[PDB]
Structures are given as structure tokens and as C-alpha cells.
Amino acid sequence: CTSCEDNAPATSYCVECSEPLCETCVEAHQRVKYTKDHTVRST
Amino acid sequence: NQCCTSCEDNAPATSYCVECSEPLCETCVEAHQRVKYTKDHTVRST
Ligand SMILES: [Zn+2]
Ligand SMILES: [Zn+2]
Ligand SMILES: [Zn+2]
Ligand SMILES: [Zn+2]
């Protein structure tokens, strides 16, 4: 995950951002209005 | 005094974001920091 510095494994991928995300950053992605409608897929 | 209206938690706003022009609760502030689009927003404690 390169959206945080928790050195956490990416367990998801956002299509629009083309970014792997950890579970914490997925939850943040869903809470922020600009990103809440992004297509986030489990990896 | 104010609720955060950027989530449905009916949580107290402790901050405001200049770029969003929105009061934010602690959970929303933390989320703001973890999303690349909002990470550099000017979030000010109230
Ligand atoms: Zn992360
Ligand atoms: Zn995204
Ligand atoms: Zn909130
Ligand atoms: Zn903002």
C-alpha cells in the first residue's frame, strides 16, 4: 500500500486510482466523498 | 457545536477543511489523510 506508511500489505486495488490499498486505506477511500464511488477490488 | 456532515456518524466536528469547505470529525480527518486526493488539503483544528 502506498496510500499510508503502516507498511501494510495491499489486500485491495482501486481501478480509478490504479493503486493497491491496505484495508485501512480502503475504509478511508470509502469515507472520502471524492473516492467513495471508486471501484475497489479484493486481491 | 457542529456535526460533521461528510459522514453519517452524526459525530462532532473537531476540524474544518478549507478546500472542501466542510467541518470534519476525527474519523473523517484521519480518512482525509489516507486518500491521495485529499492528503494535502488544509485541515484546521477548531
Ligand atoms: Zn494503506
Ligand atoms: Zn480510488
Ligand atoms: Zn465525519
Ligand atoms: Zn478536504
Side-chain angles (χ1 to χ4, degrees), chain A residues 14 17 29 38:
Chain A
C14 176
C17 295
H29 227 70
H38 282 195

Short mmCIF file of all heavy atoms in Angstrom, two decimals, chain A residues 14 17 29 38, ligand 2:
data_model
loop_
_atom_site.label_atom_id
_atom_site.label_comp_id
_atom_site.label_asym_id
_atom_site.label_seq_id
_atom_site.Cartn_x
_atom_site.Cartn_y
_atom_site.Cartn_z
N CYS A 14 -7.69 -0.23 -6.23
CA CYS A 14 -8.65 0.70 -6.77
C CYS A 14 -8.38 0.92 -8.27
O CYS A 14 -7.30 1.32 -8.65
CB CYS A 14 -8.57 2.06 -6.09
SG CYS A 14 -9.70 3.24 -6.86
N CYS A 17 -7.91 4.80 -9.37
CA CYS A 17 -6.62 5.30 -8.90
C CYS A 17 -5.46 4.46 -9.45
O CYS A 17 -4.32 4.92 -9.43
CB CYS A 17 -6.55 5.28 -7.38
SG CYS A 17 -7.71 6.40 -6.56
N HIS A 29 -10.85 5.31 1.75
CA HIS A 29 -11.27 5.56 0.36
C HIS A 29 -12.80 5.64 0.29
O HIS A 29 -13.36 6.45 -0.45
CB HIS A 29 -10.77 4.43 -0.55
CG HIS A 29 -10.13 4.89 -1.82
ND1 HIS A 29 -8.91 5.51 -1.82
CD2 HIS A 29 -10.49 4.76 -3.12
CE1 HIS A 29 -8.54 5.77 -3.06
NE2 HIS A 29 -9.50 5.33 -3.88
N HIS A 38 -15.38 4.91 -6.08
CA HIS A 38 -14.33 4.19 -6.81
C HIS A 38 -14.60 2.68 -6.73
O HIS A 38 -15.19 2.17 -5.78
CB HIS A 38 -12.94 4.57 -6.28
CG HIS A 38 -12.46 5.89 -6.78
ND1 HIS A 38 -11.15 6.28 -6.68
CD2 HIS A 38 -13.12 6.90 -7.41
CE1 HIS A 38 -11.01 7.48 -7.23
NE2 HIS A 38 -12.20 7.87 -7.69
ZN ZN C 2 -9.50 5.29 -5.94
#
